[PDB]
Write a protein that binds this ligand. Structure first.
Ligand SMILES: [Zn+2]
Ligand SMILES: [Zn+2]
Length: 70
């Protein structure tokens, strides 16, 4: 009996959040698209810092999706 393999750790992903109020982000920076925020209110506030991180980045790889309505 010569065996020994183990590495199937299961972990669930976490939803995005704001950077100022860590509140429901469900939004993306309309400048770099590499940040999350609840509303423009915070975006402006935490802009002095984020700014540096924000770098002109055009849209790249897009995912597939399709919402619905009731
Ligand atoms: Zn916020
Ligand atoms: Zn940005």
């Amino acid at each position: 009996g010569s065996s020994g393999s183990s590495g199937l750790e299961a972990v669930a992903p976490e939803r995005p959040r704001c950077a100022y109020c860590s509140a429901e982000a469900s939004k993306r920076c309309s400048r770099c698209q590499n940040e999350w925020y609840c509303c423009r209110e915070c975006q402006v506030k935490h802009w002095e810092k984020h700014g540096k991180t924000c770098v002109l980045a055009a849209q790249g790889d897009r995912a597939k999706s399709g919402p619905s309505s009731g």
